Amino acid sequence: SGVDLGTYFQSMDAESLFREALSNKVDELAHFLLRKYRAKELVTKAEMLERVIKNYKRCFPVIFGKASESLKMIFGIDVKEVDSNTYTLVTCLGLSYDGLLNQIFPKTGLLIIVLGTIAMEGDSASEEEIWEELGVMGVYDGREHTVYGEPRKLLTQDWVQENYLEYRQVRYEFLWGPRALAETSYVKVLEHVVRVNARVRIAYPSLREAALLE
């Protein structure tokens, strides 16, 4: 029978491919969830396993966990369980706006961030203080962001016309508008900031710890 027995991979980094694979699956599940929010459809765990993480089912807690967190913080969407393994997706703080009219990425998350920034400067925040905080998270005046669009139009026009905000000549400054006061409160925005800052952070597992879920 005798043949050629001499000796993976050729050589490729399986460990770092793994954390990238998980991180891409966080991105992918997040976009999937946004679609489910747009469709006003419920979402089941089973659906998520079958349709998005068929090949990493046991990582569900971590991939779903981080995708949820991104929905909350970036998009202002809360992934609410029903209690089951079904979940509905609704805007944070009960806000009625998401900016889908852009029929893709909700802008609730950035509204919430601008409302919190004013809530923290007290009764009003200056134009400059709003641009600084938007800057720290990569949103700049006159620069069309992919997820949020052009922000000056967004702050100064859309959100003024929608009455979430007021923008006036005092330097310039922003204040909550009647809709913002109607739909939410300073107390609720600040408690939300507080709950987000205090959240249990999720670590990506190593290849070893992930093998230890079976």
* 119 & 191 share domain: yes
67, 29 Cβ separation under 8 angstroms: yes
Q: In the numeric block, which tokens belong to residue 90? A: 């609704």
Q: In the numeric block, which tokens belong to residue 105? A: 């990425």
Q: In the numeric block, which tokens belong to residue 177? A: 């508008």
User: What is the helix (H) or strand (E) element at residue 66, kind and residue range?
Assistant: helix 60-70
User: What 3-state DSSP class applies to 167?
Assistant: strand
* 193 & 127 share domain: yes
| DSSP annotation of 73 | I
Q: Are strands 77-81 and 86-91 parallel, antiparallel or unpaired?
A: antiparallel
Read off φ and ψ for residue 9, nearest 5 degrees: -70, -80
* 1 & 42 share domain: yes
Q: How far is CA 117 from CA 23, 35, 96, 173, 197, in A?
A: 29, 29, 19, 12, 14
Q: How far apart are CA 108 and CA 78, in angstroms?
A: 11
139, 148 Cβ separation under 8 angstroms: yes
User: What is the helix (H) or strand (E) element at residue 192, kind and residue range?
Assistant: helix 186-197
Place of tokens 């330097």: 171
Q: How far apart are CA 7 and CA 96, in angstroms?
A: 63
* 39 & 20 share domain: yes
Q: What angle do CA 130, 121, 196 make, to 5 degrees?
A: 80
Residues with Cβ within 8 Å of residue 136, at least 6 apart in sequence: none
64: preceding bond cis by omega (within 30 degrees): no
* 33 & 8 share domain: yes
Among 81, 101, 121, the domain-final residue is: 101
Q: How far apart are CA 171 and CA 149, in angstroms?
A: 24
* 131 & 92 share domain: no
Residues with Cβ within 8 Å of residue 139, at least 6 apart in sequence: 110, 145, 148, 151
Q: In the numeric block, which tokens belong to residue 196? A: 């987000």
73, 109 Cβ separation under 8 angstroms: yes
Give the distance between the most distant pair of CA atoms in the chain.
91
Q: Could you tell me the residue range of the domain that residue 122 belongs to?
A: 102-214
24, 16 Cβ separation under 8 angstroms: no
User: What 3-state DSSP class applies to 79?
Assistant: strand
* 42 & 95 share domain: yes
* 139 & 157 share domain: yes
Q: How far apart are CA 53 and CA 157, in angstroms?
A: 40
Query: In the PDB record, what is the listed experimental method?
Result: X-ray
By C-alpha distance, which of 141, 129, 32 is closest to 89? 32
Q: How far is CA 213 from CA 16, 51, 58, in A?
A: 19, 21, 6
DSSP 3-state percent helix, strand, coil across the chain (nearest 5): 50, 10, 35
* 206 & 132 share domain: yes
* 96 & 172 share domain: no
Place of tokens 């009219």: 101
- Number of domains the chain contains: 2
Among 74, 101, 128, the domain-final residue is: 101
Among 48, 83, 101, the domain-final residue is: 101
Given in angstroms, what resolution was this structure solved at? 2.3
* 94 & 113 share domain: no
63, 26 Cβ separation under 8 angstroms: yes
- Count of Cβ atoms closer than 10 Å to residue 176 Cβ: 22
* 48 & 80 share domain: yes
DSSP characters for 82-148? ----EEEEEEGGG-S-------SS--HHHHHHHHHHHHHHSS-EEHHHHHHHHHHTT--TTS-BTTT
Domain with residue 43: its CATH number is 1.10.10.1200
Q: In the numeric block, which tokens belong to residue 55? A: 């090949």
